[PDB]
Paper text:
4-hydroxy-2-oxoglutarate (HOG) aldolase is a unique enzyme in the hydroxyproline degradation pathway catalyzing the cleavage of HOG to pyruvate and glyoxylate. The crystal structures of the apoenzyme and pyruvate-Schiff base intermediate complex are the first for any HOGA enzyme to date and reveal a tetrameric structure composed of a dimer of dimers as well as the identity of active site residues. As mentioned briefly above, the crystallographic symmetry of the hHOGA crystals generate a tetrameric assembly containing a dimer of dimers. Residues 26–259 form an (α/β)8 TIM barrel domain, while residues 260–327 form a three-helical bundle at the C-terminus.
Author numbering:
A (entry chain A), B (entry chain A), C (entry chain A), D (entry chain A): 32 to 327
Write the structure that this text describes.
């Protein structure tokens, strides 16, 4: 199956002044981001505001991104839904419009009953029925749960489950996942630029990083430094990405990411309600996280 | 606007052996539950597996429940979605098929950015555009977040926001909400039978209780004892509902609730994947929580 | 053994300008607090800054309080240490200087290994070797842990373990503890004034309340209203104590409590380092919590 | 001031069958551990059961360890107490019996009031008054709190605060601390062997690792591989230390560590109550974590 190693920005969904998906701005942004040596794009991931899109919007976004992308760049499409059957259908439909692989977030509304066995069954079914490879996706900042290690190890054995994006930032956990799945075809990607160097050191083979929407060359440079054994230079660059990374993830989220996109000359624009614009104090804090690290 | 005081079971969604909504079993269960002096039914709440239904299923369930209900029983319909615009549309559509009021869960996927201001704006918009009264719904066991008190107080002032269901079980918080909204038309309902007596003592005026799907007469009796000042008898009954309540909520959730429904002669049946059947050990623990408190 | 029902303030330790224990101010405060119909005093509890005192100070504080107290008021002395053997020795020494009962906080530094069995063994040993009755004390805001219900139930069977102070504010948990220990001589006290009415409703028989250091008559009035079935008046008073209670506990802690003591004419004075004075903003917020509820 | 870079085991306190400190077994263990190229010993750290020792035992343990140690090995002594004044006195007394530096755990009982300012003031005072260099110590598994980054950065400026041991395992946080204190004389040590390689990659210069009590050569080898740029071999070794490290820290704690010490031929022996022996199931799980990684 495919090779998912490398760097991807999880791309945003631009909206118009009336909250419609702005496909013109989407295409413009993607053409700009195309200049960086990314493996591809993560589309309708958390940073894409997928919970705020209709079924049909979610599908058409994947379809349009496929058209604005080179054939040899990998389209990793967010197809995860709460129900297993809905996830199957979304995964099939996204494959049909050209997704190379399906990145499937853990169901999480019923967190108390999302046991290892439940999650194993969910992902096994999706992987069984998906015409494209499946990538597991654990993101406790949004879901309140880690996909358990025992479940990851079991799932890594499935022929159609090719890797995972872990956004939790626990490199002891990530190291253990790499180690325990070493006999399988199973590639681990970091879910943020803040712990990317450490992830590479522990055996992860790339990153899906919101920060790459604005510092794409720097995140790719970090990958290069890690892959060529330049760990001292990698350290220095990694250090300077920590605060800007926190700014567009844990601190200010997608509103922070879109604001910084605006300031860098991309179309950031509005989020969909209930997400709101940053307060002036938040804007200033966001600015400082970039300026004090030499990026703005 | 309506008076929402009283007891409601948040009704389940029965499914067939092929995971389709079983409307026959739904109607049969509702006719049975109709015998208890509930204020009404909460439909497509958390216990209804609403995240696992399609838009259309969610709507048709509300429509069918309205048909199987007396006109003077209150249909409180779960219309909450992640996006504000989707919530508006679902709320309008549910009103159109006969919902008396809309119970609107807090958006929660982007928990880090669900500030008081964001949630205020979300609920204000929905309440502005809803043709039926809005009931706030805070359930941190599923969402990972409490609707903040300051937001509740602000929202209580809206003419079209008539109350709240709090499932968090913090009676200091609930007491404070009652106290701070005392000048408004704003009725608080407990979200579980485990803290119902204490909620009444603090000024809540009812409960939406999963446990009422199986111990409806007992939950209604508890209401009666609290409303008539029989606090000593209320205490004894409340004590005996704690473990059975924990069993069908925090311990074993909807799978536990549906299993106990089966054992009591209702149609419990299967959950939709990814929810799974109880393990034999879990079944036994569930059984013990009911038997040791004299209910089975 | 004794009857521990009723209200107690957990008294502070006054310090001089040079951080020495101010026994003169201690005696003056206690004589003032003696006017309220408390069951007694909780001495060297969390609000007494016991972790900041030497062994000898902790003992001499209990000794001096005993001298400044009526013989028929109950001295409940905080004797809990991390180690079981140290707890035994402190409990014996405090008994020797006149403590009526020992209130024993859960060891908590090694929280990951403080299992039910470990805590059962700890309290069983202390109760075995203590010449005075033992009161369990669970306070997760300071310890990060709840004494587990199964451990409480087992321990309630010990002839020398006569009750518990629970500060966690979970009235479902407290209701369950009352219910499961109903066959034992085991009295439950709430650990704060914020959930006192609900605690009484669920079968607790009193409260150890930091707030009683400044609103002693009001907390005692609340007890009276609960014990005489005046639940409607109890509700109104309970509502008005919630914010002032939060102010001197979860919001501003002992520095908040001592500041309000100053403002009410008691000696509040300084805490021992590392505790610090309130910032001006914190002072103002503290003031507002009291003034907006009609107490200042 | 000293150079604290390198590996240290935080040594245990052996106890006799009657719970007395077994200084004979302590000396025997230390002589054995002396064979590894550690920088020194961490004495009366968390793994030493310091909360369970008397003042005098804590002091005499440091004194005896100093006697059983080479003059050129660094004695890093745990002198942290809840109160600032007690910490000062313990730090001075430990210096007097030969400690090279004082490792000072964050006060944590009053966690809600342990603000950055409070912790800054606490450590500034201790560092002002200590005749030996101070090492900050953050260990949220035991304290429930992280020493905040802003406080660490401020404190790193003090001439007598020479570094920190962080046990929290968050390499984004550790990377940020290294980066923000880069202009100061301030050395960061990892607090466990599970994230040691990643810590080195991010700019930490050593580790205080419970695991080094039993796999001292392996932890030192890991240091060597990181310091010589052998990251591929470092990865493989780091992977194999993760589960054994979890076993003697987060899973089974000091009882697990002492049991494995027994099995490796050291004196592990009993913990002080309330710590208990492992259950047979826990013993078996501990065994498996070592055997499945090739260490036993
Ligand atoms: K695979
Ligand atoms: K209203
Ligand atoms: K007893
Ligand atoms: K320094």
């Amino acid at each position: 199956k495919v090779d998912i190693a490398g760097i991807y920005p999880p791309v945003t969904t631009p909206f118009t002044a009336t909250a419609e998906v702005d496909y013109g701005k989407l295409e413009e942004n993607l053409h700009k981001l195309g200049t960086f040596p990314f493996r591809g794009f993560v589309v309708q991931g958390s940073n894409g505001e997928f919970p705020f899109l209709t079924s049909s919007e979610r599908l058409e976004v994947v379809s349009r991104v496929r058209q604005a992308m080179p054939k040899n760049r990998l389209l990793l499409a967010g197809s995860g839904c709460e129900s297993t059957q809905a996830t199957v259908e979304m995964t099939v439909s996204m494959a049909q419009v050209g997704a190379d692989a399906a990145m499937v977030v853990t169901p999480c509304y019923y967190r108390g009953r999302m046991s290892s066995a439940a999650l194993i069954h969910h992902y096994t079914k999706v992987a069984d029925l998906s015409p494209i490879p499946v990538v597991l996706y654990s993101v406790p900042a949004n879901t309140g749960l880690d996909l358990p290690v025992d479940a990851v190890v079991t799932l890594s054995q499935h022929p159609n489950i090719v890797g995972m994006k872990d956004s939790g930032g626990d490199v002891t956990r990530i190291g253990l996942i790499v180690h325990k799945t070493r006999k399988q075809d199973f590639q681990v990607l970091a879910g943020s630029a803040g712990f990317l160097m450490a992830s590479y050191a522990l055996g992860a083979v790339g990153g899906v990083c919101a920060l790459a929407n604005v510092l794409g060359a720097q995140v790719c440079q970090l990958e290069r430094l890690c892959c060529t054994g330049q760990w001292e230079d990698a350290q220095k660059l990694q250090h300077r990405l920590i605060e800007p990374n926190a700014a567009v993830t844990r601190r200010f989220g997608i509103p922070g990411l879109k604001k910084i996109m605006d300031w860098f000359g991309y179309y950031g624009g509005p989020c969909r309600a209930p997400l709101q614009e940053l307060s002036p104090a938040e804007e200033e804090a966001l600015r400082m996280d970039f300026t004090s690290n030499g990026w703005l």
